[PDB]
Each structure stands twice: as structure tokens, then as C-alpha cells.
Design an enzyme around this catalytic site. Structure first.
Site, PDB file in Angstrom:
ATOM      1  N   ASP A 134      -9.601   5.478   9.643  1.00 22.77           N
ATOM      2  CA  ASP A 134      -9.614   5.801   8.346  1.00 22.77           C
ATOM      3  C   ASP A 134      -9.155   7.126   7.592  1.00 22.77           C
ATOM      4  OD1 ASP A 134     -10.856   3.137   7.948  1.00 22.77           O
ATOM      5  OD2 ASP A 134     -12.702   3.789   8.561  1.00 22.77           O
TER       6      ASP A 134
ATOM      7  N   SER B 258      -5.575   9.432   2.591  1.00 23.94           N
ATOM      8  CA  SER B 258      -4.753   8.515   2.625  1.00 23.94           C
ATOM      9  C   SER B 258      -3.530   8.819   1.856  1.00 23.94           C
ATOM     10  CB  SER B 258      -5.168   7.027   2.769  1.00 23.94           C
ATOM     11  OG  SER B 258      -5.731   6.603   4.071  1.00 23.94           O
TER      12      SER B 258
ATOM     13  N   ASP C 202      -7.913  -0.194  -2.964  1.00 29.00           N
ATOM     14  CA  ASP C 202      -8.558   1.098  -3.624  1.00 29.00           C
ATOM     15  C   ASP C 202      -8.000   1.488  -5.258  1.00 29.00           C
ATOM     16  OD1 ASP C 202      -9.952   1.179  -1.333  1.00 29.00           O
ATOM     17  OD2 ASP C 202      -8.532   2.997  -0.754  1.00 29.00           O
TER      18      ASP C 202
ATOM     19  N   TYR D 124       0.864  -1.359   0.009  1.00 24.08           N
ATOM     20  CA  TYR D 124      -0.004   0.145   0.059  1.00 24.08           C
ATOM     21  C   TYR D 124       0.980   1.179   0.014  1.00 24.08           C
ATOM     22  CZ  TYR D 124      -3.928   3.216   1.108  1.00 24.08           C
ATOM     23  OH  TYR D 124      -4.780   4.185   1.119  1.00 24.08           O
TER      24      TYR D 124
ATOM     25  N   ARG E 245      -1.094   7.788  -3.962  1.00 24.66           N
ATOM     26  CA  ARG E 245      -2.045   6.869  -3.435  1.00 24.66           C
ATOM     27  C   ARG E 245      -3.260   7.423  -3.045  1.00 24.66           C
ATOM     28  NH1 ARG E 245       0.631   4.668   2.006  1.00 24.66           N
ATOM     29  NH2 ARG E 245      -0.839   6.447   2.852  1.00 24.66           N
ATOM     30  N   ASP E 246      -4.613   6.838  -3.387  1.00 21.91           N
ATOM     31  CA  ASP E 246      -5.638   7.202  -2.691  1.00 21.91           C
ATOM     32  C   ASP E 246      -6.262   8.352  -3.802  1.00 21.91           C
ATOM     33  OD1 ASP E 246      -7.997   6.944  -1.256  1.00 21.91           O
ATOM     34  OD2 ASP E 246      -7.367   8.157   0.603  1.00 21.91           O
TER      35      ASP E 246
HETATM   36  O1  LIG Z   1     -13.840   1.132   1.042  1.00 26.78           O
HETATM   37  C1  LIG Z   1     -12.699   1.967   1.437  1.00 26.78           C
HETATM   38  C2  LIG Z   1     -12.506   2.993   0.327  1.00 26.78           C
HETATM   39  O2  LIG Z   1     -13.773   3.772  -0.054  1.00 26.78           O
HETATM   40  C3  LIG Z   1     -13.251   4.615  -1.313  1.00 26.78           C
HETATM   41  O3  LIG Z   1     -14.665   5.368  -1.736  1.00 26.78           O
HETATM   42  C4  LIG Z   1     -15.556   4.650  -2.357  1.00 26.78           C
HETATM   43  C5  LIG Z   1     -16.673   3.832  -1.706  1.00 26.78           C
HETATM   44  O4  LIG Z   1     -16.113   2.812  -0.766  1.00 26.78           O
HETATM   45  C6  LIG Z   1     -17.797   3.405  -2.406  1.00 26.78           C
HETATM   46  O5  LIG Z   1     -18.642   3.216  -1.500  1.00 26.78           O
HETATM   47  C7  LIG Z   1     -18.113   4.314  -3.366  1.00 26.78           C
HETATM   48  O6  LIG Z   1     -18.762   5.357  -2.621  1.00 26.78           O
HETATM   49  O7  LIG Z   1     -17.082   4.967  -4.150  1.00 26.78           O
HETATM   50  C8  LIG Z   1     -16.114   5.496  -3.480  1.00 26.78           C
HETATM   51  C9  LIG Z   1     -14.833   5.751  -4.391  1.00 26.78           C
HETATM   52  O8  LIG Z   1     -14.963   6.953  -5.261  1.00 26.78           O
HETATM   53  C10 LIG Z   1     -12.215   5.600  -0.693  1.00 26.78           C
HETATM   54  O9  LIG Z   1     -11.778   6.615  -1.782  1.00 26.78           O
HETATM   55  C11 LIG Z   1     -11.031   5.141  -0.197  1.00 26.78           C
HETATM   56  O10 LIG Z   1     -10.303   5.807   0.492  1.00 26.78           O
HETATM   57  C12 LIG Z   1     -11.489   3.907   0.832  1.00 26.78           C
HETATM   58  O11 LIG Z   1     -10.394   3.310   1.396  1.00 26.78           O
HETATM   59  O1  LIG Z   2      -4.815   0.892   8.786  1.00 22.98           O
HETATM   60  C1  LIG Z   2      -4.288   0.374   7.752  1.00 22.98           C
HETATM   61  C2  LIG Z   2      -3.980   1.537   6.830  1.00 22.98           C
HETATM   62  O2  LIG Z   2      -5.150   2.287   6.606  1.00 22.98           O
HETATM   63  C3  LIG Z   2      -5.080   3.326   5.697  1.00 22.98           C
HETATM   64  O3  LIG Z   2      -6.142   4.084   5.900  1.00 22.98           O
HETATM   65  C4  LIG Z   2      -3.711   4.332   6.193  1.00 22.98           C
HETATM   66  O4  LIG Z   2      -3.540   5.386   5.045  1.00 22.98           O
HETATM   67  C5  LIG Z   2      -2.617   3.569   6.312  1.00 22.98           C
HETATM   68  O5  LIG Z   2      -1.635   4.324   6.838  1.00 22.98           O
HETATM   69  C6  LIG Z   2      -2.851   2.169   7.072  1.00 22.98           C
HETATM   70  O6  LIG Z   2      -1.642   1.379   6.872  1.00 22.98           O
END
Ligand SMILES: OC[C@H]1O[C@@H](O[C@H]2[C@H](O)[C@@H](O)[C@@H](O)O[C@@H]2CO)[C@H](O)[C@@H](O)[C@@H]1O
Ligand SMILES: OC[C@H]1O[C@@H](O)[C@H](O)[C@@H](O)[C@@H]1O
Ligand SMILES: OC[C@H]1O[C@@H](O[C@H]2[C@H](O)[C@@H](O)[C@H](O)O[C@@H]2CO)[C@H](O)[C@@H](O)[C@@H]1O
Length: 358
Positions: A313, A95, A135, A83, A88-89
């Protein structure tokens, strides 16, 4: 199918989570709840390699697991999450990580993989199961209109491919992250998802070590709900088993007899969200079904605990560069600390609300 990565191994318990849980349990004032909380350290979880700082930790886990296997007569299995993608993200703020595309991101990532491979190579008697980049691929299925995701697409695909290709060389069993029923399980998203996962699997040589997909990571969905959570209106695939049952045959027809692992670590309490897309620090969540290979489905190798419950989260602090307003919604626990850092009050509730109870 024939080769379930968990058969015949003892899972090495996460020392990182054990350290968090032991410290957390000592601060839980009710003695009965405190002993329940401490017992969580004996439940197998995935340890996240969320930064290069965690790579030496991986080395300690592999060496400790190897020694434990020798002294208990067992073969040991270490559970990790890869990860650390650049950018990222890409569809959220909470994140964001240490690598960015402009800062030699792809090269730094592939070296991060190289460092991980170099650790794993030294401990061939230890099995490793890795979840690959939560993700990321799901964002490439549905969020290509998000410009950060669009601009990261080639880097994500190259980096995920490098991880799969090179971790396979040291025999790591891998499950690519595949979102959850409310993300990729919509019937309309199943085929776009299958097509992307197929291309990724092909690009990595269809390696037998690429077992399949991980679902519900860091989410809250049921594996099997007797009645749909009301948030699922409009999606017939209202739980993870429906999603997996619908997606797996598409992979099979593309040539990949993929199997799955499903996070249930925060799924003990259903029907607690206002809206399905509320993913951040959902209030009243409880620890869910304990990890097991008795999954109830031909497609599922294991129920797992991937996200370590109690690690946040995302921050609810709007002064943070990682602030995502999902973390301030009415069903999000507030105040909440930065993603990945310990959230004591949230952990205590996860313990109290565990279903089945701890
Ligand atoms: O499931 C954890 C991750 O969710 C991500 O957003 C998603 C969401 O889960 C869905 O339900 C729907 O709403 O679409 C989203 C994506 O645009 C989120 O971006 C991540 O940070 C989370 O880890
Ligand atoms: O808790 C597990 C993982 O969750 C993620 O949302 C965080 O960005 C990470 O730093 C972490 O390792
Ligand atoms: O959107 C078209 C799609 O609708 C499906 O039924 C929906 C229904 O429209 C909605 O009122 C309800 O809440 O959810 C169901 C799906 O669970 C219909 O089954 C499909 O054939 C159709 O393509």
C-alpha cells in the site's frame, strides 16, 4: 437486478498476480503454507492498469481470454482497475503516479483511456469489468479542503467522465470507486456522496454500462460484522453492508438503480486497527471472503478481490518522495516497499491468516 455482469461468464484469472503468487509461494518455506499460497493464483482478482506500461498487458489478457473462451466453450470476463489520474492520490503521498496536471496531464490521461479502448475494441467476445479510479471521487466528496484535491477537481471530474463515456462505447461494465464505510458511509457524508455520484453518472449519459459503485477497495472493512469493529465509534454504518444499504436508496431516488461490488480480499481479519483511518499495510491482515455473486444483499452484484493482497500500500521509507506517515503507524507492517510492489512477508501473513482458510 436483472443484469449482473458476472452471470454466465468465467472470470479470467490475472496472469500478473499469478506470476507474483507463483514466485512468492516458492519462497514460503513451510510446505503446507506454500501450497495454500500457490492456490491464491486460482482466485479471481482485479488487475490494475496503474500506468501506461500496463496497457499492452491488457491486450494480452483480452487475447488470452478470447482464446480460452473459444477452447473451453465459455465466455470470459476480464477484471481491471483504471488507476492513472493526473495528480493521483491527492490526499496522500504513497501512490502518486506518472501523470501530473501541468505535464499535459488531462490530455495524457484521456489518451491512456483511448489506448485502453483501442485494445478492448479488438476483443468484443470478452467481457470487461472495470473499477474506475479508486479514491478519486471519495476525495472530491470529503477532501476539497486539501489543496491538491481542490486544484485537481476539474481534472478528476473531466478524466473520470472521459473514462466512463468512452469505455461505455466498447461495452465495459463499470463500478466507480466509492471509498468505504469509514470514509463515505458516515451518515453525514451519504448525501454529498450520492449527489456527486449522481452528477458523474448524469454527465456520462446514465449509460447502462455504469452499473454502480465499488467499495472497500484496498481497505480492510468487514462486509458484515456481528459486532462493530471498535474503530467505528460514532458511525452507525460500521461495515460495508450498512454503508451500501444507506447509500443505495439515495441513488435510486436520484434515478440510478445502482449496484455495488465490495472488496474483501484483505478483510478476513477484523478488529486489528488502532484507528479507522489506518489504511497502510495493516499488520495481521488475512485474505477474506472469496469472490462470489452470493452477496447477501439486493444492492451487491459481487464480493470481489480488487486490491491484490501482497502488493504494498505504500513505502515506510521516509527518504522516499512517496512517503506517507500512515505507513509508519504502529499497526503498519514495516519495513514496507513502494506502493504496488511485492511485499513478500505481508503476502505470507495474508495466506496464513486467511479467513476462510486457504
Ligand atoms: O481506503 C484506501 C485509501 O484510503 C485513503 O484515506 C482515507 C481513509 O481510507 C479513510 O479511512 C479516512 O481516514 O479518510 C482518508 C482520506 O483522507 C488514502 O488516501 C488512499 O491512499 C487509500 O488508497
Ligand atoms: O496493488 C494495486 C495498486 O495499489 C496501489 O496502491 C499502487 O499505487 C498501484 O501501483 C497498484 O497497482
Ligand atoms: O453526532 C450526532 C449524532 O450522534 C448519533 O449517536 C452517536 C453517539 O453520539 C456516539 O456517542 C456513538 O458513539 O455513536 C452514535 C452513532 O453511532 C445519533 O444517533 C445521531 O442521531 C446524531 O445525529
Amino acid at each position: 437486478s436483472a443484469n449482473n455482469p458476472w452471470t454466465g461468464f468465467q472470470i479470467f484469472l490475472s496472469p500478473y498476480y499469478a506470476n507474483e503468487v507463483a514466485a512468492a509461494a516458492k519462497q514460503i518455506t513451510d510446505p503446507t503454507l506454500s501450497s495454500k499460497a500457490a492456490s491464491v493464483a486460482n482466485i479471481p482478482t482485479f488487475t490494475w492498469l496503474d500506468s501506461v506500461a500496463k496497457i499492452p498487458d491488457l491486450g494480452t489478457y483480452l487475447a488470452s481470454a478470447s482464446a480460452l473462451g473459444k477452447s473451453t466453450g465459455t465466455k470470459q470476463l476480464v477484471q481491471i482497475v483504471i488507476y492513472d489520474l493526473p495528480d493521483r492520490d491527492c490526499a496522500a503521498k504513497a501512490s502518486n503516479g506518472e501523470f501530473s496536471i501541468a505535464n499535459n496531464g488531462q490530455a495524457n490521461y484521456e489518451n491512456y483511456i483511448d489506448q485502453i479502448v483501442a485494445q478492448i475494441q479488438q476483443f468484443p467476445d470478452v467481457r470487461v469489468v472495470a473499477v474506475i479510479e479508486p479514491d478519486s471521487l471519495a476525495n472530491l466528496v470529503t477532501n476539497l479542503n486539501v489543496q491538491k484535491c481542490a486544484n485537481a477537481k476539474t481534472t478528476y471530474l473531466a478524466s473520470v467522465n472521459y473514462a466512463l463515456t468512452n469505455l461505455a462505447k466498447v461495452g465495459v461494465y463499470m463500478y466507480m470507486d466509492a471509498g468505504h464505510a469509514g470514509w463515505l458511509g458516515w451518515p453525514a457524508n451519504l448525501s454529498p456522496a450520492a449527489q456527486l455520484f449522481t452528477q458523474v453518472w448524469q454527465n456520462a449519459g446514465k449509460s447502462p454500462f455504469i452499473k454502480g459503485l465499488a467499495t472497500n477497495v484496498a481497505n480492510y472493512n468487514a462486509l458484515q460484522a456481528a459486532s462493530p469493529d471498535p474503530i467505528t465509534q460514532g458511525n452507525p454504518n460500521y461495515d460495508e453492508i450498512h454503508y451500501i444499504n444507506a447509500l443505495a436508496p439515495l441513488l435510486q431516488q436520484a434515478g440510478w438503480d445502482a449496484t455495488f461490488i465490495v472488496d474483501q480480499g484483505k478483510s478476513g481479519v477484523q478488529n486489528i486497527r488502532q484507528q479507522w483511518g489506518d489504511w497502510c499495510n495493516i499488520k495481521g491482515a488475512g485474505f477474506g471472503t472469496r469472490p462470489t455473486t452470493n452477496t447477501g444483499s439486493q444492492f451487491i452484484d459481487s464480493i470481489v478481490w480488487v486490491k491484490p493482497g501482497g502488493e504494498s500500500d505504500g513505502t515506510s521509507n521516509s527518504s522516499s518522495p512517496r512517503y506517507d506517515s500512515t505507513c509508519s503507524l504502529p499497526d503498519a507492517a514495516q519495513p514496507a516497499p513502494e506502493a504496488g510492489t511485492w511485499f513478500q512477508a505481508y503476502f505470507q501473513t495474508l495466506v496464513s491468516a486467511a479467513n476462510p482458510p486457504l
